[PDB]
Design a protein around this ligand. Sequence first.
Ligand SMILES: CCOC(=O)NCc1ccc(-n2c(S)nnc2-c2cc(C(C)C)c(O)cc2O)cc1
Length: 208
Amino acid sequence: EVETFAFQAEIAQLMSLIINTFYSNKEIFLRELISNSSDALDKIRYESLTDPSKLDSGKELHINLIPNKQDRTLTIVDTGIGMTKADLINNLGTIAKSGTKAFMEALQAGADISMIGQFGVGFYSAYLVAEKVTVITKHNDDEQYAWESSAGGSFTVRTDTGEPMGRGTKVILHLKEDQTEYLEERRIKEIVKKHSQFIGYPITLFVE
Ligand SMILES: CCOC(=O)NCc1ccc(-n2c(S)nnc2-c2cc(C(C)C)c(O)cc2O)cc1
């Protein structure tokens, strides 16, 4: 069973802006996703301080980057606190409505697209490089679900089975045809060092 939803108008407009604005500095998408992963990891870390059983679904707190040139995908995987089905539908746990409003106002005051993460909506910068995004997540309090959107005003949510993760979130970027540089090892290393050099969790770049 697949459920199809319409984005809130403000979010559809944010995504359209990201997709259609001329802006060459696309590489900042990765730091925004790594930042979200770090936040999710902080959350499960702090929770586990008073309830160790929260880590029964996995003790290791880390981030993996997985390029695949055959599929033309870049996948960011973390073992953070994950998201419930409800939070997936509610704009994947972000304050998208109020965040988008503040972001647009900032763009009128001299801000540019690279400031997007300051307003809680950095996830949508994924559409600078991806034609489709799949978000697979598992929270301790719910089952495993897959969110997906190629923009155009809608997203889908379904249950996900076949490769269960213990806990956390996996963001699969289906890259646009002209953005395959982000599958190259030296390019990914360069971007991590430039924008995500000091993060409180290990980042592992998989080899092909
Ligand atoms: C509510 C304040 O934060 C936001 O509005 N947005 C940033 C944010 C949202 C959800 C998460 N998150 C949680 S909680 N659990 N998993 C995630 C998570 C979400 C994403 C995007 C799909 C939004 C991600 O790339 C990685 C994550 O671990 C982390 C940061």
